[PDB]
């Protein structure tokens, strides 16, 4: 698993790979690791697929109820829901979740929830198996208030390096862009990022 | 383990139980009766883990006496055996099972027949002309398969039990300090004065 979420001027972009493996076997090479918990609040998942999917389902239920009761929730609200779920069930959960959301009040925001349930707000967050390999690179290339195209290129480069070095990551690069215009889905095939 | 033997002849049922209870490296008692009278015509011998034996035996005894007082009737040995096997089967899957193996010797007055039932702590029950629990079977079952006859008398069964006790005392490392022998027949349960 190789997931990340980067905030830029026009909003936020979440990127991930599509490789889910059971040991050394490519179980699924077309996995959508970006899950939508609200209209403009998405999450990248890593770890136990069942645990992450269950947490995402429960968060989506809670956010739909929050929308029906008190209107659109902020990104911090979904982050706190994820945090409470992961912390109060830390003894039976193995999930790392990067929650990225764009609202008109706070522009774009990225929170990360590592194991143990902790929550940390970052301008950009990286996680997953391959994340390690692209730590330094990201720290050497990330910039504040980037444009959409340069942010896409940054995420593409980082995920391509992670895929190339990590055997647990691969497939295609899936990105979801949350901006004032709405939600955009981008897919980048191997021939694009391998040639990089 | 303890010596628990039983034989069913034509006219009675004979049960033999070791007299020795030892805790640690010391033989604590040499005159222990490992039997509980369930009904005036049904006796039960028991052996197993310390504590569980007496508790389970007296529990079964209290239940049998309650049923006898309620209905003014003595339960058949088959019904008592089924009751005990059901209790043990419920026990083994409880939080802490009873580790007690029992021999039920009874005289069915409705059939005028002697009945011997062997039940292990797991809830497995059988009707046998001769039975034992633990290592006693390994020695006594050959002798019973050879000598036992269906039309034997009470004295012949006592002789067979004495032969079994002699073989046990000869080829066993544990000193069980002899056995107590009890006969159940139409006149009730009685204990042999000296064996």
């Amino acid at each position: 698993t190789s997931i990340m979420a980067v905030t830029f001027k026009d909003g936020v972009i979440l990127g991930a790979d599509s490789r889910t493996t059971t040991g050394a076997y490519i179980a699924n090479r077309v996995t959508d690791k970006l899950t939508r918990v609200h209209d403009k609040i998405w999450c990248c998942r890593s770890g136990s697929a069942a645990d992450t999917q269950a947490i995402a389902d429960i968060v989506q239920y809670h956010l739909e109820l929050y929308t029906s009761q008190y209107g659109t929730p902020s990104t911090e609200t979904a982050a706190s829901v994820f945090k409470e779920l992961c912390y109060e069930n830390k003894d039976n959960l193995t999930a790392g979740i990067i929650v990225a959301g764009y609202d008109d009040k706070n522009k774009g925001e990225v929170y990360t929830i590592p194991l143990g349930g902790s929550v940390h707000k970052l301008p950009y967050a990286i996680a997953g198996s391959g994340s390690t390999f692209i730590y330094g690179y990201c720290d050497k290339n990330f910039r504040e208030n980037m444009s959409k195209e340069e942010t896409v290129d940054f995420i593409k480069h980082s995920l391509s390096q992670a895929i190339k070095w990590d055997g647990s990551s691969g497939g295609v690069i899936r990105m979801v862009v949350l901006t004032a215009a709405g939600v955009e889905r981008l897919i980048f095939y191997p021939d694009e990022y391998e040639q990089l | 383990m303890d010596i628990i033997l039983g034989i069913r002849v034509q006219d009675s049922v004979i049960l033999a139980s070791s007299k020795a209870v030892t805790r640690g490296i010391s033989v604590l008692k040499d005159s222990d009766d490992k039997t509980r009278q369930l009904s005036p015509h049904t006796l039960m011998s028991f052996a197993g883990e310390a504590g569980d034996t007496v508790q389970f035996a007296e529990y079964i005894q209290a239940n049998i006496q309650l049923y006898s007082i309620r209905e003014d009737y003595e339960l058949s040995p088959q019904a008592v055996s089924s009751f005990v096997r059901q209790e043990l089967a419920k026990s083994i899957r409880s939080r802490r099972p009873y580790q007690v193996n029992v021999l039920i010797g009874g005289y069915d007055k409705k059939k005028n027949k002697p009945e011997l039932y062997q039940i292990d702590y797991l809830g497995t029950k059988v009707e046998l002309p001769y039975g034992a629990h633990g290592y006693s079977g390994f020695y006594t079952f050959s002798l019973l398969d050879h000598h036992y006859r269906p039309d034997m008398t009470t004295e012949e069964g006592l002789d067979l039990l004495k032969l079994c006790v002699q073989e046990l005392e000869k080829r066993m490392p544990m000193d069980f300090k002899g056995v107590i022998v009890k006969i159940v027949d139409k006149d009730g349960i009685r204990q042999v004065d000296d064996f």
């Binding site: - | 209905e71 009737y73 339960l75 058949s76 088959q78 019904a79 089924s82 009751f83 059901q86 409705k110």
Partner: protein
């Protein structure tokens, strides 16, 4: 709160009687007539089916005679639903006794269990008692053939021949006039059928309006014969009450 609406079903009258027990007994007095007769070679049960219609299917209907097990049967007077609930519980208790002891349950034990359930309903819980009276016909290897009666009060009794339901006093008087300790199963069938035909509220006693059953020895094996409508018609025309 809800105290004002509490009927207090389990209370004593100033005379020392349970209101709901007497009222359920009255309800049963309006129900059908059930009669059991214990002859030296069997037991017979006969009941009067209240429901009457040309379109009712009497073949598949059994509102008054039910099977507790293979050796015990019951006749019910009163509410059919409460009766079926109690009969299901009785079957369950009988099968529990069988599983525990590998022996058929004695009749008195089952009757006492049902009567204790009824008593518990007339002492705690604040619920209405079952408006049902039971006539138990059974056979065990200790007391042989046995005929018992139970009422919503939770009390049970044993009888040689007894009836519950409607017109209890007149039916009991007729039975006491025509009962003998040496009679057989056929004489008991005749007596029960005559008592039903003489204590019925309908115009005439037809096969559609009644059910019959016999616990016999036909071997060393008892048998429960639940009478089919045609067999009921045949026993009716044989005794003379009806005609072919």
């Amino acid at each position: 709160g809800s105290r004002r609406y509490d009927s207090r079903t389990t209370i004593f009258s100033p005379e020392g009687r349970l209101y709901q027990v007497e009222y359920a007994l009255e309800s049963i007095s309006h129900a059908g007539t059930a009669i059991g007769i214990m002859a030296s070679d069997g037991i017979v049960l006969a009941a009067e089916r209240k429901v009457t219609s040309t379109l009712l299917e009497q073949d598949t209907s059994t509102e008054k005679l039910y099977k507790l097990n293979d050796k015990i049967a019951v006749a019910v007077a009163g509410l059919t639903a409460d009766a079926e609930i109690l009969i299901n519980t009785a079957r369950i208790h009988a099968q529990n006794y069988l599983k525990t002891y590998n022996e058929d349950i004695p009749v008195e034990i089952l009757v006492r269990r049902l009567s204790d359930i009824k008593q518990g309903y007339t002492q705690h819980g604040g619920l209405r008692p079952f408006g049902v009276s039971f006539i138990y016909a059974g056979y065990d290897d200790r007391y042989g053939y046995q005929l018992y009666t139970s009422n919503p009060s939770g009390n049970y009794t044993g009888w040689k021949a007894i009836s519950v339901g409607a017109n209890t006093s007149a039916a009991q008087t007729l039975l006491q006039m025509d009962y003998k300790d040496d009679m057989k199963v056929d004489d008991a069938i005749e007596l029960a059928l005559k008592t039903l035909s003489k204590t019925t509220d309908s115009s005439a006693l037809t096969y559609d309006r009644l059910e019959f059953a016999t616990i016999r020895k036909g071997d060393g094996e008892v048998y429960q014969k639940i009478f089919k409508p045609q067999e009921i018609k045949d026993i009716l025309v044989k005794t003379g009450i009806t005609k072919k």
